[PDB]
Design a protein around this ligand. Sequence first.
Ligand SMILES: Nc1ncnc2c1ncn2[C@@H]1O[C@H](COP(=O)(O)OP(=O)(O)O)[C@@H](O)[C@H]1O
Ligand SMILES: Nc1ncnc2c1ncn2[C@@H]1O[C@H](COP(=O)(O)OP(=O)(O)O)[C@@H](O)[C@H]1O
Ligand SMILES: Nc1ncnc2c1ncn2[C@@H]1O[C@H](COP(=O)(O)OP(=O)(O)O)[C@@H](O)[C@H]1O
Ligand SMILES: Nc1ncnc2c1ncn2[C@@H]1O[C@H](COP(=O)(O)OP(=O)(O)O)[C@@H](O)[C@H]1O
Ligand SMILES: [Mg+2]
Ligand SMILES: [Mg+2]
Ligand SMILES: [Mg+2]
Ligand SMILES: [Mg+2]
Lengths: 496, 496, 496, 88
Amino acid sequence: DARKNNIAAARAIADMVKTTLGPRGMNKMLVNSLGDVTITNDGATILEEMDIEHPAAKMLKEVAKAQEEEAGDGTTTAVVLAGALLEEAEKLIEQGIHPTTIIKGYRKAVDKALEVLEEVAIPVDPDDEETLKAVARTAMTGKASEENREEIADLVVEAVLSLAEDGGGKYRVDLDNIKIEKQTGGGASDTELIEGVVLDKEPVHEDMPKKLENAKVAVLDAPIISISSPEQFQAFLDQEEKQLREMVDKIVDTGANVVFCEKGIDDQVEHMLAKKGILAVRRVKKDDLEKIAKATGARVVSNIDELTPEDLGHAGLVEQRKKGEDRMVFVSGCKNEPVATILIRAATEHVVEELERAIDDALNAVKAAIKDGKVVPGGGAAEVAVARKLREYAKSLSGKEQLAIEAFADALEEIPRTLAENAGLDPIDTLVQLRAAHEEGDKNIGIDCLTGEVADMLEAGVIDPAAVKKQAIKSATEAATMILRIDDIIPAKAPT
Amino acid sequence: DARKNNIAAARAIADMVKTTLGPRGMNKMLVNSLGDVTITNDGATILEEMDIEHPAAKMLKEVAKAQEEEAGDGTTTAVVLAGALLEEAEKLIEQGIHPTTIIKGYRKAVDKALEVLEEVAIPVDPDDEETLKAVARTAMTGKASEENREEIADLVVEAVLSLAEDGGGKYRVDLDNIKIEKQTGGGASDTELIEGVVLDKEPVHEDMPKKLENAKVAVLDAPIISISSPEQFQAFLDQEEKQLREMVDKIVDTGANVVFCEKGIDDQVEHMLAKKGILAVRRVKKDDLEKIAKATGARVVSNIDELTPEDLGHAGLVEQRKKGEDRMVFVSGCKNEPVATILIRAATEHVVEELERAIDDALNAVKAAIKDGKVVPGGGAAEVAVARKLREYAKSLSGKEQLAIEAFADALEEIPRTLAENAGLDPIDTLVQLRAAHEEGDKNIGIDCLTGEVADMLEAGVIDPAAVKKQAIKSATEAATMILRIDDIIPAKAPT
Amino acid sequence: DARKNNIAAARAIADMVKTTLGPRGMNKMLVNSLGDVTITNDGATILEEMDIEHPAAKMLKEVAKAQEEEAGDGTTTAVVLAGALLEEAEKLIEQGIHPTTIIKGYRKAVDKALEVLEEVAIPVDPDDEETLKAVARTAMTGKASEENREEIADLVVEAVLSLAEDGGGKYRVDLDNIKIEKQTGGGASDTELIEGVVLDKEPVHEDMPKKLENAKVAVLDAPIISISSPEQFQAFLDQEEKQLREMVDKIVDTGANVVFCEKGIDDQVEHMLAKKGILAVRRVKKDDLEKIAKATGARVVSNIDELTPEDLGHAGLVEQRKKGEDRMVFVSGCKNEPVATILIRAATEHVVEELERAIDDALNAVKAAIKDGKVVPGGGAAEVAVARKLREYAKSLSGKEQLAIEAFADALEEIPRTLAENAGLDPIDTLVQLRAAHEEGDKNIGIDCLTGEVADMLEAGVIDPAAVKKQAIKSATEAATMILRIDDIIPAKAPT
Amino acid sequence: DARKNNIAAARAIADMVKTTLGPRGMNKMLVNSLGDVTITNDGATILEEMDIEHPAAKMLKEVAKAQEEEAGDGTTTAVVLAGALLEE
Ligand SMILES: Nc1ncnc2c1ncn2[C@@H]1O[C@H](COP(=O)(O)OP(=O)(O)O)[C@@H](O)[C@H]1O
Ligand SMILES: Nc1ncnc2c1ncn2[C@@H]1O[C@H](COP(=O)(O)OP(=O)(O)O)[C@@H](O)[C@H]1O
Ligand SMILES: Nc1ncnc2c1ncn2[C@@H]1O[C@H](COP(=O)(O)OP(=O)(O)O)[C@@H](O)[C@H]1O
Ligand SMILES: Nc1ncnc2c1ncn2[C@@H]1O[C@H](COP(=O)(O)OP(=O)(O)O)[C@@H](O)[C@H]1O
Ligand SMILES: [Mg+2]
Ligand SMILES: [Mg+2]
Ligand SMILES: [Mg+2]
Ligand SMILES: [Mg+2]
């Protein structure tokens, strides 16, 4: 029963990632043969760098990748939904229903599920500050410490509004646009708008001018013998330094005094650069070098011989500030475009990475909320409501597809059960309470794991975007279906 | 019993590929030692990159290759028919019939099978749009999602009609003639007629002219020291750039400004090509480079010294459009011939490959329908009708060949049984229903796996080209025959 | 698959007993741990004293016992028919038909098969001597040597007619009524009507009167110390002989002079019996003693004290004839009832037992023919005719019971296939020839294994009573059905 | 119970470093495959260069490093407190 084997592998991954769904998501420990350990709770990492020899499991990598690509959030919801869906699918196969009937029933159930989620979702304008803060806090949830939730949410909404590039309504609040720097210790209160890309490298030379207002900023990427007579070696050294003088002189004619180079340096090179007072940062990555080129306005010039004054950028300020322990060049004043890197502070490296993922997911969610402008109650409320309407549809329909639709309803209902279980509440009792509440006509009663009770989600500020839940359902459906559609494992010829 | 061993291997492959026959064919997962996984359901792939140590099984590779070469559709049908034929052959040798008598009976059976398939087939004009759409949907069936069936069928017929090169009645609608590009995400609605081969490569230089109306397009394939004195190296560099200047100058005298090169480039090379505004795409394969040469009209010039203005092609437009995520040069306006590559969009990589195979099979089927102009009802209806007339022939013939012909009829009837089994219906009951229906005189009652019932195929739009089924029967017979003709495995001297 | 296991066991027994069906039945060799060996070919013995650990096979003991009880002929036919029925049942479960549908189909098949056999059977009067001889030869076939077939058939019909006790039409030709004796060597020409039960024991005393015309025959069953003074032993002996004297005196007053006693004797006892000239045979079994009591007319007297002249029987003659090697008392002249034992001569012990079984089967078959007065052509002709009419019924009936009906027809045709295989002819060719013949309207064309061809059975004298075939089909049906009706093996509590 | 395993590893480390808390802290010895030996009682060193395959224990490396970075004193107090906290 290779299908049973694949279902078992998907079940194993689903139960593995089940425990990390919610504000109290019990984190997970990723250990590799090299011995490096990173503690994370966001499901994207746990699906990213885990070992999977089972190839049916290996498809869930692709499922999570697609989820992250379109939405960027809800991967753990998608995987848990897929787990519950394959639970009930296996349940229907031992009863006797053919798999294709299960697939057809799940397809119909999910079409009506997206339709139901469209109806139930409450709309939001982009000016109701409390609602945006609630969405930001709900997405922020899971990873950040309980203390700094209000602070990071406030900074998130502040950055989103202040850097709101009104590109015809759709604000281009990209992940690489908001300005943070990474550093151990201190706190999260350094997530401020510093108008420029800050590099985590020290100045090469002490007497290099640390302060340069309205500096002529340049961006470069190029890396900055046969002897016969006794003085021939000195002659070669003379002509290399002469041509070096020539290139840096035609650079100075353009006026460049601040440079960030993609490659390494040499002691003599940095010495003669600082002779004229030229900044040079080395080993600058491709992505961050491109970001710096966009921000500073100095186009990357591989062939530096054609550099002109028109090719140079400008920055309002460049400064070396001894913030914290490490030394950095706090570049500030890149006035062309809002461009930045996802580098954020915390106390210890695990917390640094956790807060990095948290802020990334936070901007993702508020961006989705602003774009789509539809928010659905979270905390399992949307799942229970869609399950109830799916059961109404089951009452409407008849046949052995009704069993499949009921299976889909139960699998969708599984998510609030997990969210309650990670909260410490008993799953069956609180889930029955949720069902009974939703049978009274109200729609926003969910589970709040911060308070550890069942309450109105709208008053508790627990709301997730509609689109993230739509894609969670869609990806879970596509995972369950394409894992069901397999029959047997066969050895495939390796491409030579 | 080495014959029994070969039969067992053929049965193993037949049962492996049986499950992937029909609209609801449960897909198969091809896993290799490298760990790459591709989900496929078209039997051609499953027979192509599977490991087969058994040589009797290895012959079915050649059978499938022949099937794809002549027909291009029906490898799964051919292999399942061969499996069923060897099923009943194994029975008949169990009874006591000598193998040569089984071969004789099978040969006569398939002669009359091709004859009756010729008579039963309903003819089609190339102007009955609904019939062509039905054929395209039936062949399209199997691999695409249920949502985009009508869409992709519409684009298939639209491309076939619009690119109908009337070459004396036989329209040259080749697989490499219709214009699609491959890209992750988006949808299948980009399968439009873009009159030119679009390359999935970015421009080398930003300031390279993205827009060039009526551009002079060229096609190239060539790849674009002892020091004594201090300046000998500089003189060598000077003469290399001088001859580079010379060859590109006599190129510019021809007027070429758009180039697609077969080999790599260098940073200085792309810099000095973009100095004059010359497009250059690298690492273009042999096949797609030949396609570009055919489309653009610029003959491939290995010895570029003989390039002349007469040798240059022309294109109405070349444009870089940021469609989706990947940056590509959307070349459009190649006015000489309709030429393109089989590269098609979808959501994820597995789905991308699935719809690529689907669209390829779709054009193959409509091409076969337009060429032959004879369509047979699908859904197993043709199989049942041919089996019924074969049983009439059995009633005519007396002797021990009658048992072989009845064996052929049962093996042929196995296809509708498989098609019902993959649909979820019980095989024996629906098979008996099909036989009873065909005994009433009507000919089009089959199995529709979308609706999951038995219905008239002609009103359900489930119809296959007659040539595809003819070649399926013929290839299955030649597989079963020449697998039966073997006696024993012996070690053969390896060629030194 | 314990049902598959039971089917396999029944298959093994069916194939074991298949080879002994017909005139040319390859005999079977029964060897036991004691080392005694008996060569037999009647399937009755083969099913009786074979070892079977498998319980499902152990049921076939009961099937064969029932067959012998009702019919007395056709155990091998029943077992082979059960084997072929389970052949086709196993294939039908392979296709997917539920077992209960097969049971229902077989029930309907066998109701109609009994009806068909009733119609096809040709009637016979009890005075057509050639027809009775043909029936006797057909039944006697299988076991008797080819030389003495005509002879033993002639004696069979002669004994049946001469000992025809007209009990209201139903002649009581019992197996224990016709007079034969067993003795090694000689020949079968001693199967003559000797009017009396003849006991394989020598006279106890030489001077015992061997010849006694109109002898007063008696039948008995009873078996024919403290010392103080020297002569007390002698007085005890005197009174024992005195009481012996008075009991044999009151016997002599009745007049008995011939006795056949159930128990042993003593030297003095036989001496004083022969003093007056009294015959005494010892160790006569229960069955043969009861037979002698019936034949001689002397009721068995446990308490001999009440024996009277009225209680004595009479016999026309008693004689000791030194026929062959062993010495014997050829008792002849028991005038009350025809009573005898199944003891028959041949050359060797194996041939003795073979001839005994063959003659018993011959009287059984001729008795059945006289009783029922309906005879069907044998040699597989009846099976093929019933199969053809069953196929006509299948053409009448529509549904999945038609498949079961066809299964029953093929399982019924398997009998002529076996009968041809044991005859040396090729099975498929002669089966096809038989089917073609029966399709031309004639109904008596069968297989004659003596001539080794296919010919009309009625002119070949190959005809077997209809009731035997009816019971064969019925027993095979019950066997196949109740073997199919089992699910799995469970350990049963042993009764304490 | 992988949580029980992690708690057991943390307990083992806590009990190991428990004995070196105070003026009369019984010192510990650090022996490596090279054979070099250093006698130390400050828990910083003890948590510094000890072999720990268990990764849950390997987090206590980072805990001690944070402690030394901010405070510079109290690594043994922190680890013993963590041990007692995980006890209860
Ligand atoms: N404050 C909250 N209280 C209770 N449940 C919450 C809260 N915030 C979010 N959730 C639940 O957590 C789910 C998202 O979990 P999360 O782990 O953040 O997703 P992902 O792992 O994909 O980032 C939401 O669908 C919602 O039901
Ligand atoms: N719409 C349909 N409904 C039911 N059966 C279909 C339908 N379309 C095709 N089929 C069946 O599937 C067969 C072709 O299966 P397919 O897997 O496409 O072949 P291949 O694997 O060789 O491409 C046809 O011969 C037909 O009997
Ligand atoms: N002379 C014959 N020639 C050919 N077949 C015969 C002949 N006599 C009997 N048979 C076949 O043998 C069958 C009976 O076989 P037999 O072994 O005698 O049964 P059993 O073992 O029960 O006594 C009959 O049904 C008939 O078809
Ligand atoms: N003179 C003392 N008498 C008793 N206890 C002491 C004394 N000095 C320090 N302590 C205890 O030892 C603790 C610090 O132990 P120590 O091993 O020095 O810490 P660390 O190993 O981090 O340097 C203090 O919290 C205190 O309770
Ligand atoms: Mg989330
Ligand atoms: Mg096909
Ligand atoms: Mg018999
Ligand atoms: Mg201290």
